[PDB]
Ligand binder design. Structure first.
Ligand code: CL
Ligand code: CL
Ligand code: CL
Ligand code: MG
Ligand code: MG
Ligand code: MG
Lengths: 144, 144, 144, 143, 144, 144, 144, 53
RNA sequence: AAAAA
RNA sequence: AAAAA
RNA sequence: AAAAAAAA
RNA sequence: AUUUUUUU
RNA sequence: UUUUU
RNA sequence: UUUU
RNA sequence: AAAAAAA
RNA sequence: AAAAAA
RNA sequence: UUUUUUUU
RNA sequence: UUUUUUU
RNA sequence: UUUUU
RNA sequence: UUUUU
């Protein structure tokens, strides 16, 4: 291979874009309370802690969830997801339970292509229900 | 296969080196505080406990971590890693969380070929962040 | 190839060993007197000059010898080796002579697998006989 | 059909009333914190293993497993340092558990050149651990 | 092959048996009287002289008998075997005679799979008849 | 073929050894008593009767035994062998008997490679038991 | 292979020989004077220094020679070999000269099969002529 | 210690270069050794990120 | 899908 | 798979 | 062959 | 195809 | 070839 | 089979 | 026709 | 070759 | 792919 | 008949 | 899929 | 399946 710099015969000025797009999976936690649904805000996806504070819209592709803390005594962990959309909220409750009390509960849902539009900070991704006090979210989305 | 000593028709004196190189991965532990990142010194790789007290430089290739103690109550173990380089520190935070509260949390990162230079004891390998008070590291490196 | 750091999906904590083994070819010299057999000590292999000051035993596999100085006047260089073992010394005298007064003499022997046990510093490897006053030894062994 | 038959035996054969025996011997040893315990070979010769008639043995491999729980907040670990009469080793083959409730395991194989006999007074390996009763399984050849 | 010790990546604790079975060929001699059949006790198999004093039961597979001393004057050696069982003794007399007066007489019998149960020291294997004062026995059996 | 002397275009002085090894099969006899075991000394291998008084050590590979004299009256010849090793003696009593009173008894054993080390005159190779007063031994060994 | 002793089902007593033959290559030196031919005695082959003091005859096959010391000033080394036989000496002078003043001069000759009879110590192998004061000889022979 | 500046000289047509990427080094003994000795030579790689041993 | 490893 | 030119 | 890091 | 029986 | 299962 |  | 082999 | 999903 | 190896 | 490094 | 060719 | 070959 090359051990020194080499010359590039660059031609015309190309098409450029100083602010491109970025497909990412954003790991962040949300605080969930017993017998209560938490509307996950899209604004949690725009932050300097994920390098996405320069974005104002994002296209969510798939959401996954894991329980972040231990379940109540004598109970196993569970976590539910209800997809939310501006054109109409869903009533599905994708539930995933843990078969071991010491192990996390996990579940996720994929957003179809016909429902993959941009979402701003004031929007919400989904509702979360769990017997645990905190839920770890990993959202695969496209920032633009 | 032979049962007796046999002669070796040796020739000219060969090329020798009394202090060769060594490809190792060093297991050693560090103490971590809550909400604080601990810088892993390179001088931990040089010790008589690893037969590496004769070296002064080392070329690190990959680092991996495990939580050495139990996490706080109601928490799952996690561990983060931020690679550091003398030419420029990274801002990455490769995190690994445990799905079982009784299980370690593991994560690692690989150093590319273009960044595999030597490091002396005063240098640092990476920062570590974890809710556990100790972390076990296995640093695959090349002592020279 | 790659140009930046990449995450490693590490798993369970592996089997580690801080003090491993090491197959080495150790070069060192011995001062020999004319007509007198010099017993080469095993303690000469364990030295910080060879990065082997952390070992206490070694499994010798093959021994090779070269005359380090010029022979007496009107003579050619020669060097002999008699293998020694804690279970019974041998009487072989593997000799190598030089066909040139300016050139080194060389000879070597291989220890059979059945006789490849450990040796501590207080032991001896073999006896050397030569008309030259110094002999260079290159010993292929396995430190443990 | 399902009844006895006769064997047309020939000359008297070569016999050996006390032959060899390749075995895997499970036993446990008590270990202290921060102290290395020397495992005696004499623990392999016992009526609990049908080996009280043997006086020597050729060891091939050693494997260890912690038998009791580690200290609080700690994970289990176990180290093995091979020992030989021709020269002790300095390796510390260590194995740790990724779960506090799970044993820590590690082992080492003896090469086909250091496989000589060892009597009861001989030692096989040093053991370090944070648990108090690590268990051992040793594959060896009694003779 | 390897000249040093290697690491064994052991896993979970296996299944163990400190007291295993043993298929053996037990050689022992019994004294026989003229015109009198001798019941071979099974307890002859359990002995420290066979490394079998730790067993209390054995499954006999076959029995082979050789004459151990010389026959009377002018006669050739012979030996008979009558298998004995707890469910029902046999009346077979497997006889082997010697064609040379100076040569042992040999005979044996095999126990079928349907008759291969355990026996204790109080039981008897077979009856031995011979014109020689002593008979050697090599019993192939499974200790358990 | 050639019928006269032929010139040899010799080159450099080669590697030499005036005292090499020797793979041999050494026969001798030992006097044995009744019921008592006789430890066979290794020093019997080093004698001018076998061209071996120049060796001090030897690597034994296999031992075989025969009964050298006639057995007691009415008995058949037998001979046992128990291997001895400096690291640890064996308890195996390899035994072979004679099916003819006028015929010798024979038995032997082979030493594994891992147990093939050197033995000096002060060492013992095996024990011998027989009902005959003398035993003939043939030992395959590698003198060094 | 095997890790323990195994039984050898030996048969009848074989054919043995305590003092076998030995095909050897014997190295030794002889002093030679300038202009004088030195007869090499066969008795030099029989020595304890070669493990051959138990032989009284030998069948010589081939003889090679090397100059053991440096030649006179300005001269190159040479060495001549005139074969000798009890039935009749030869007049050949197999000579080899060195193309470097610092290197040895080598030559040799092979004895045909028809001339490979035994030779006792009182006989002579060949005459040697050289300008150096010592000559090294390697004799491939068959001691019997 | 072999200086890198020895590589920049008009005797090598290289006095216009201020930097250089070294790939391999080879050495030979230029003068005769002391009496009764054989020549030897050792090389110890040095780097700005860390000296070898 | 004979024994032990 | 072992030796001794 | 070689303990260590990896790996359908 | 390591050991102990059975094995042409 | 020579010496060894 | 002997040679360089 | 310039760096490390050319089998 | 990155980041993500299969 | 780092250190020792095996018939010019 | 191996190939890899700037005109 | 964007970027850089 | 033993016997006898
Ligand atoms: Cl260094
Ligand atoms: Cl040296
Ligand atoms: Cl030969
Ligand atoms: Mg030369
Ligand atoms: Mg335990
Ligand atoms: Mg020189």
């Amino acid at each position: 291979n090359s051990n020194v710099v080499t010359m590039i015969r660059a031609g015309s000025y190309p098409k450029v874009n100083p602010t491109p797009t970025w497909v990412r999976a954003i790991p962040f936690e949300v605080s969930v309370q017993s017998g209560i649904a938490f509307k996950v805000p899209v604004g949690s996806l725009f932050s300097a802690n994920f390098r996405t504070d320069s974005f104002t819209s994002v296209t969510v592709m798939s959401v996954r969830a894991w329980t972040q803390l231990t379940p109540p005594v004598n109970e196993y962990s569970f976590v539910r997801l209800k997809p939310l959309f501006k054109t109409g909220d869903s009533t599905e409750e994708f539930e995933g339970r843990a078969s071991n009390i010491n192990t996390r509960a996990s579940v996720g849902y994929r957003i179809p292509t016909n429902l993959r539009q941009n979402t701003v900070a004031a929007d919400n991704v989904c509702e979360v229900r769990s017997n645990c006090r905190q839920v770890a979210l990993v959202i695969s989305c496209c920032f633009n």
